Amino acid sequence: QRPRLSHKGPMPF
Amino acid sequence: CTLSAEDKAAVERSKMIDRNLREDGEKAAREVKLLLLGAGESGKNTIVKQMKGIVETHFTFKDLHFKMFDVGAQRSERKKWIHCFEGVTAIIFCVALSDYDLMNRMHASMKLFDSICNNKWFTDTSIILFLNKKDLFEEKIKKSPLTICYPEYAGSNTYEEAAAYIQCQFEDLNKRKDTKEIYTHFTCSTDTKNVQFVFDAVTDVIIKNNLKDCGLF
Amino acid sequence: SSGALIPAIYMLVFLLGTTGNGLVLWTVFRSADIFIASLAVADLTFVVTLPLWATYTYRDYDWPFGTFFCKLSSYLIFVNMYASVFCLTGLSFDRYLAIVRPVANARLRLRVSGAVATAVLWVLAALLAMPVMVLRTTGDLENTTKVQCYMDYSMVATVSSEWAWEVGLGVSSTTVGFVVPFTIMLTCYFFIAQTIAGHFRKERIEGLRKRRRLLSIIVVLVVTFALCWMPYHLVKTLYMLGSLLHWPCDFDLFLMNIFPYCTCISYVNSCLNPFLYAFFDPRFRQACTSMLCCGQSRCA
Amino acid sequence: NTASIAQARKLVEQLKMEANIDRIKVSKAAADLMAYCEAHAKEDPLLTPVPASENPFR
Amino acid sequence: SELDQLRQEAEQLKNQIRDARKACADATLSQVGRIQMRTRRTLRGHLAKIYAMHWGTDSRLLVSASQDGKLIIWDSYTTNKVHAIPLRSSWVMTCAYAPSGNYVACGGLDNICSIYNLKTREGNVRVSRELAGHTGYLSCCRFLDDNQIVTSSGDTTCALWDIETGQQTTTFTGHTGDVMSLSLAPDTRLFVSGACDASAKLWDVREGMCRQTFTGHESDINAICFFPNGNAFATGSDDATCRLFDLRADQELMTYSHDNIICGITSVSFSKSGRLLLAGYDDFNCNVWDALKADRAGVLAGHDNRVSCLGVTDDGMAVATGSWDSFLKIW
């Protein structure tokens, strides 16, 4: 599992 | 702007005057003002000479500009002009140690210290207490103990013990121990450290004030 | 299980922030009173536009708001991270200019106090927070039939090197948002602590009670920030780096299982900032209590 | 001493000079104050405000 | 026994004065509307406490003596500053603006009343004279004319100067405490000076003799003003009461007391018709006492610190008050 971490929280990077 | 040429020139004049006032006000916020006070017939004049109505004395030490408002020659009510000096950086206080044998001069000096240190305008202004004429006291103490003027004293007639006792008696009259501090320096007629003691005490006051102000308390 | 916990935690920090920083903003309407006010605005703006993501997490993919709000709210939450960290650091450097060198540093505090630091920090915040709305769009993924909020990184770069773009952006934000400001704050408070320990004499009769309050507040002032903004960037860059070199399955899974909590820990400092910077000095205590008791009745 | 006696003479002379004054009944002075305060009520722009067209401050 | 005989003579004369005052009190002054004033101009530019203020005679120009060592001559109508006169000693406690509008006196803690010159060719304010001769701080300076000035110092004396030669023309002695207040009659023939021993005296500017003594206060007297017809004081004290003495009846007439007020008065001035008696208090507010019924008719709030100066323009159009926060407002 390697999903983007930006589509679950309010901070992309 | 619905203003003739004369009113626009007037507004340019007002702007120039505001520019001059703001510059002079930023300039006079760099100076350290020290109210020089003291009992009658003390070492106030010799301190004035060694450091350099209202008499001002301007001097500088390591790029810090001072001002010493000596309040001499005004025998009027203190409650009517003492609030002019609310905001000085510190209060210098000159007491003569040789006056304990001449009611009692030291008792009157302590009364004036009590009236000044506990005043309602000076609830945040430190005191730089000086004790002049230490050598004449040193010479006189070996002959007359302090019992003539300090009955509770049960110590020796030695310079160090008695000087510490007087320093404690004077620091005791401060009833606001957590907002103002009393810096005591034992000076004499020929002592080249007075300006150093004043500079160090003023730096301490300035730093503790910036701490109270920038929010750290 | 966390699907309801994360939204509830966001709501709890929302209620706390819009109360603490609200009261601070009400009571502050002294140098370092511009920075308190600026810090209060960042906390109120930072937690107010959260209930939108609070509701959104409840379904983890359903974003029942406009495509535009995926830009406005994300831009707010990023500009506010940067403004809050930048302002708090400017506040510590102003304290250093005022407490360590009070005589030789009058001119610098005249130049770079709350007059210019506020404008410049906010400009740098807005200028660094650009790639958060330039690259952020909205899409309804057919694999879930739910309108999710996500980033593309395609509106600017080629997909052939998308791994390097995300690496660069992730490393750059932490470097400009937690590395430099935290080092600056640590240096400033180390020197202020040396000065406080040097000036307040210990060999005094009940005079050192001014030496433990100040040193304790400095230590707390550094440690709160070092323990709030650290785990977030820690796990973030740990995951973005380990997933690219060589990693197992019990490591990455733990990182993904703990990130929705490291992103909730970085929201408690936003609520703590009043109780550490503004309601600590007894001046705001008295004025704020008088104001809170004037118009409010004596009986609940 | 002579200084106290001389100052006492000066004080008693001044205080006796303050005695030879022609007083009037307090009701008369009160009536005069009322009459003045009423005769000039129409020219007090703090007691009877002035219209905004005539007020020079705004 | 000359000392005791003269003391008994003084006591007998005091009894005679008291009985003569009692024999003239058949009634009181006690036998409306609410005022609301709004700040029009706020005059900014000072950096420390403001200690005095005086209106020009044409009702446009001000003078504001603050402890930066700077007099500023404001232009009330548009809030501009005409001049900014730097002082030679920043411990200023008073000021005045000449009736013709030419000179601006300014004194204080240096015991020296300096007289500035506003209208000269060289385009700047030049000191015209420095009237030395007092031994204590200077409290109030009033311009009788362009060539005479009355000063009142902590020497317990008021003294009429002569600007041309700089020499003290007459000296008024008789007070026992400091003199903190002064006000000239509308015809400029009489003074009143309030001393810090609860007494206000009536001087004669052309002779130097004291005529009456207004007693009744219980503390200092911080400020005095004349009734616009020239027959009533209004002495503001430190025990938080104004009083209106009457010159003809030689008796106190009314008191402005209010149990909610424990702070002393710093300045007092009447209105143009003589009905409103404004007053500036230590509690940062000003009140408007209905000078014929003793009731309050307003409050002028909006200062963050003590109100130290106050003066109603000569037209009655405005009331300018200054306060120790360096903001001079115009109601």
Side-chain angles (χ1 to χ4, degrees), chain A residues 2-13, chain B residues 1-79 81-123 125-184 186-217, chain C residues 1-139 141-143 145-203 205-246 248-282 284-300, chain D, chain E residues 1-105 107-152 154-162 164-209 211-213 215-251 253-331:
Chain A
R2 198 177 132 195
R4 298 279 80 80
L5 77 162
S6 42
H7 68 238
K8 61 175 67 80
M11 298 176 189
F13 52 85
Chain B
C1 295
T2 78
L3 314 167
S4 43
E6 288 144 334
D7 213 326
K8 290 170 189 171
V11 175
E12 298 175 40
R13 178 173 179 84
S14 163
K15 280 168 188 180
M16 286 305 304
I17 279 177
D18 253 344
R19 272 194 168 186
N20 281 345
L21 301 198
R22 178 188 66 100
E23 289 184 3
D24 295 349
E26 259 179 13
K27 166 185 177 180
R30 289 183 170 104
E31 289 175 340
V32 172
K33 315 193 178 191
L34 314 162
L35 168 70
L36 170 58
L37 192 62
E41 311 109 352
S42 45
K44 188 167 59 181
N45 307 306
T46 317
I47 293 312
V48 163
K49 303 326 301 172
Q50 206 295 319
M51 298 270 275
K52 184 178 191 183
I54 279 292
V55 185
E56 295 213 26
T57 307
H58 306 178
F59 65 109
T60 184
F61 191 88
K62 294 179 185 177
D63 274 318
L64 190 55
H65 293 285
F66 293 114
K67 276 185 167 166
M68 198 168 322
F69 318 131
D70 187 3
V71 301
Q74 277 193 355
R75 304 324 167 195
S76 43
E77 287 303 328
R78 275 210 208 284
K79 53 172 182 180
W81 54 264
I82 200 72
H83 55 243
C84 282
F85 301 107
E86 179 183 332
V88 289
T89 294
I91 302 172
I92 297 182
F93 206 103
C94 293
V95 168
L97 272 189
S98 198
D99 262 7
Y100 75 111
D101 308 325
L102 311 95
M103 206 87 210
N104 182 34
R105 289 201 180 186
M106 192 78 72
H107 269 178
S109 282
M110 288 202 306
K111 183 188 313 307
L112 181 50
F113 194 103
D114 180 72
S115 157
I116 279 298
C117 187
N118 314 325
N119 205 357
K120 49 164 209 154
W121 315 106
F122 301 113
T123 214
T125 290
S126 89
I127 294 194
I128 302 170
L129 172 60
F130 271 73
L131 290 151
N132 272 279
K133 299 183 203 166
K134 76 168 169 57
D135 279 287
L136 283 68
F137 167 78
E138 188 148 78
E139 205 288 336
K140 282 162 80 144
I141 180 181
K142 293 141 51 202
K143 319 164 53 63
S144 189
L146 296 94
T147 310
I148 178 175
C149 84
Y150 271 105
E152 319 199 288
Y153 188 68
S156 75
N157 60 89
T158 320
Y159 166 62
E160 291 78 0
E161 195 181 24
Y165 180 62
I166 280 182
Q167 170 180 327
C168 274
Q169 285 290 325
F170 270 111
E171 280 206 10
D172 189 313
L173 296 182
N174 161 41
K175 290 167 185 164
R176 288 145 155 72
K177 294 180 181 291
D178 208 87
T179 174
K180 67 202 287 173
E181 171 60 5
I182 287 174
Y183 314 82
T184 299
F186 277 87
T187 193
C188 74
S189 316
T190 80
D191 213 327
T192 42
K193 300 297 185 177
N194 307 317
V195 181
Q196 197 51 44
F197 184 95
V198 173
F199 178 71
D200 288 339
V202 160
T203 298
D204 280 357
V205 185
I206 283 186
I207 274 179
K208 294 175 186 190
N209 272 355
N210 280 349
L211 279 179
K212 291 190 181 186
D213 169 74
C214 291
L216 274 182
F217 262 83
Chain C
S1 309
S2 56
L5 295 174
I6 291 16
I9 303 301
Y10 280 61
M11 289 188 177
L12 188 147
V13 313
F14 163 81
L15 177 63
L16 286 173
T18 321
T19 303
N21 289 104
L23 187 54
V24 158
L25 188 147
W26 177 61
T27 189
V28 81
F29 276 132
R30 257 172 54 174
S31 295
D33 214 7
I34 315 101
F35 290 109
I36 302 313
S38 184
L39 195 70
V41 157
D43 308 334
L44 194 61
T45 59
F46 193 101
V47 295
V48 150
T49 189
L50 187 58
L52 298 181
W53 298 87
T55 295
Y56 166 105
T57 302
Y58 204 99
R59 311 138 187 182
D60 235 341
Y61 277 84
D62 184 295
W63 177 233
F65 298 93
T67 300
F68 155 83
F69 287 112
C70 183
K71 293 179 179 179
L72 181 66
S73 157
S74 199
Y75 179 81
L76 275 195
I77 273 190
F78 211 59
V79 63
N80 289 337
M81 167 172 90
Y82 275 76
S84 178
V85 162
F86 273 130
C87 239
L88 188 147
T89 287
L91 175 51
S92 275
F93 183 86
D94 160 71
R95 268 173 186 183
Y96 162 82
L97 267 190
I99 296 146
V100 161
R101 285 303 279 278
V103 158
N105 274 345
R107 68 180 193 271
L108 291 199
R109 197 190 184 192
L110 287 186
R111 296 171 192 169
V112 309
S113 172
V116 173
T118 306
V120 169
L121 68 87
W122 273 104
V123 167
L124 177 63
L127 193 144
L128 279 169
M130 283 309 184
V132 75
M133 86 166 182
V134 166
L135 292 203
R136 175 152 268 209
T137 73
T138 296
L141 276 293
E142 80 296 329
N143 42 59
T145 61
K146 290 176 182 288
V147 179
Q148 71 157 20
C149 199
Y150 75 116
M151 204 113 138
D152 312 294
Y153 302 95
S154 84
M155 287 276 282
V156 69
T158 184
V159 180
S160 197
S161 84
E162 209 265 320
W163 58 273
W165 202 274
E166 211 199 340
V167 166
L169 263 298
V171 160
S172 179
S173 177
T174 189
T175 274
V176 68
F178 181 83
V179 161
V180 190
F182 181 75
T183 293
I184 293 182
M185 181 177 182
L186 176 59
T187 293
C188 295
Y189 273 158
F190 176 42
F191 286 136
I192 295 190
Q194 266 200 353
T195 286
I196 302 175
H199 287 299
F200 285 73
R201 301 294 300 181
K202 184 180 172 189
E203 57 187 1
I205 298 174
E206 302 274 9
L208 58 87
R209 293 195 320 159
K210 281 300 179 180
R211 188 171 180 173
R212 276 155 199 174
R213 182 171 190 185
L214 269 70
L215 278 184
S216 90
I217 210 62
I218 288 190
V219 169
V220 175
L221 254 119
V222 191
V223 158
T224 288
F225 181 81
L227 257 51
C228 273
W229 280 104
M230 188 53 197
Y232 169 45
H233 289 251
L234 169 64
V235 174
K236 183 169 71 172
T237 311
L238 202 43
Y239 169 89
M240 195 183 67
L241 182 139
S243 159
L244 194 140
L245 300 159
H246 194 129
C249 177
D250 202 303
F251 192 55
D252 181 65
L253 266 292
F254 176 73
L255 301 192
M256 287 296 105
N257 304 183
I258 188 60
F259 192 54
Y261 284 72
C262 284
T263 195
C264 295
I265 199 183
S266 179
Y267 292 89
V268 75
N269 163 201
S270 296
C271 298
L272 277 190
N273 274 345
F275 306 128
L276 214 56
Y277 276 98
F279 285 127
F280 162 63
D281 47 352
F284 276 181
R285 279 170 175 158
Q286 214 57 23
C288 186
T289 289
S290 199
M291 294 300 293
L292 177 138
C293 274
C294 275
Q296 271 92 318
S297 297
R298 280 290 184 180
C299 46
Chain D
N1 58 5
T2 318
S4 43
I5 298 304
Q7 80 88 49
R9 187 188 312 269
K10 173 212 160 313
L11 165 60
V12 67
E13 179 40 38
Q14 181 58 54
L15 177 63
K16 183 203 91 53
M17 187 270 258
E18 287 154 47
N20 315 317
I21 194 79
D22 44 13
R23 293 178 179 91
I24 70 182
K25 288 211 190 41
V26 63
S27 44
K28 194 161 173 183
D32 274 28
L33 295 174
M34 285 182 179
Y36 179 82
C37 275
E38 277 176 3
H40 288 239
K42 293 179 179 179
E43 308 156 14
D44 187 316
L46 304 169
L47 188 57
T48 80
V50 68
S53 72
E54 215 280 337
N55 203 313
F57 276 88
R58 191 172 291 282
Chain E
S1 171
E2 212 78 20
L3 73 170
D4 203 37
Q5 280 150 311
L6 295 174
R7 196 178 309 103
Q8 283 333 297
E9 201 76 40
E11 189 52 26
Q12 174 40 44
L13 268 295
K14 263 183 300 302
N15 260 349
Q16 202 266 0
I17 302 313
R18 185 211 60 190
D19 292 28
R21 293 188 187 201
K22 184 162 32 173
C24 288
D26 59 15
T28 82
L29 188 54
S30 192
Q31 317 169 5
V32 284
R34 189 174 187 273
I35 312 295
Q36 293 207 37
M37 301 189 175
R38 296 183 179 183
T39 294
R40 310 300 187 181
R41 326 279 181 179
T42 297
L43 300 156
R44 296 182 191 81
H46 275 300
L47 275 66
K49 326 181 163 199
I50 289 182
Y51 268 95
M53 175 261 305
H54 207 258
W55 278 99
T57 319
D58 55 353
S59 177
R60 279 203 58 155
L61 298 143
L62 285 172
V63 153
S64 316
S66 89
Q67 287 211 339
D68 324 327
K70 272 157 206 303
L71 286 163
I72 311 182
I73 300 179
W74 302 98
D75 185 10
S76 202
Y77 281 173
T78 81
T79 63
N80 291 341
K81 326 179 179 51
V82 188
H83 301 266
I85 301 175
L87 291 175
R88 302 177 164 178
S89 192
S90 59
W91 304 117
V92 49
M93 288 170 62
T94 179
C95 47
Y97 203 83
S100 295
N102 289 284
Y103 301 89
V104 185
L109 261 173
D110 200 2
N111 312 341
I112 274 176
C113 190
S114 87
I115 297 161
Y116 290 93
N117 194 350
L118 296 193
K119 289 174 171 54
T120 187
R121 169 65 200 103
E122 311 173 28
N124 54 326
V125 175
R126 334 173 295 99
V127 189
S128 163
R129 293 291 196 274
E130 280 195 358
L131 305 183
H134 277 299
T135 40
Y137 73 118
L138 215 76
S139 42
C140 206
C141 322
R142 279 307 175 247
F143 264 149
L144 209 86
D145 208 19
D146 274 357
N147 204 247
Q148 282 179 318
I149 178 179
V150 185
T151 59
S152 46
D155 181 65
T156 80
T157 52
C158 308
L160 177 65
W161 291 95
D162 195 334
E164 191 78 340
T165 80
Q167 296 283 320
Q168 190 155 316
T169 286
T170 318
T171 307
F172 313 97
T173 58
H175 268 319
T176 71
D178 313 346
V179 173
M180 287 295 297
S181 54
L182 194 85
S183 187
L184 306 170
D187 54 322
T188 66
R189 192 138 61 76
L190 307 189
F191 305 169
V192 279
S193 295
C196 293
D197 70 300
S199 73
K201 291 193 163 302
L202 190 74
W203 302 113
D204 189 319
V205 74
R206 292 171 191 172
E207 306 155 348
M209 261 165 287
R211 291 190 176 186
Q212 307 166 1
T213 317
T215 187
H217 270 294
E218 279 152 86
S219 200
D220 320 330
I221 286 186
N222 277 321
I224 284 196
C225 202
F226 251 105
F227 198 72
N229 64 34
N231 281 313
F233 309 177
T235 69
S237 44
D238 181 65
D239 71 318
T241 53
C242 277
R243 279 161 205 254
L244 188 145
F245 304 94
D246 184 284
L247 276 78
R248 306 178 201 160
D250 199 82
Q251 186 173 355
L253 210 49
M254 191 161 279
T255 83
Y256 312 121
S257 87
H258 213 254
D259 305 358
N260 318 337
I261 285 156
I262 62 156
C263 46
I265 300 159
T266 70
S267 78
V268 159
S269 48
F270 269 105
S271 168
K272 175 180 179 179
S273 54
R275 187 66 185 266
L276 299 189
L277 177 49
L278 291 90
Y281 283 68
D282 300 320
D283 65 23
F284 312 165
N285 285 348
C286 320
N287 289 29
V288 181
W289 294 99
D290 183 26
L292 287 192
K293 278 197 152 301
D295 301 308
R296 295 166 63 183
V299 168
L300 279 53
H303 280 297
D304 293 298
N305 211 330
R306 190 196 286 234
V307 159
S308 62
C309 75
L310 199 142
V312 169
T313 177
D314 295 30
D315 305 354
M317 281 286 158
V319 169
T321 79
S323 46
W324 285 10
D325 58 321
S326 70
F327 295 125
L328 185 62
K329 296 190 151 77
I330 295 196
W331 317 84

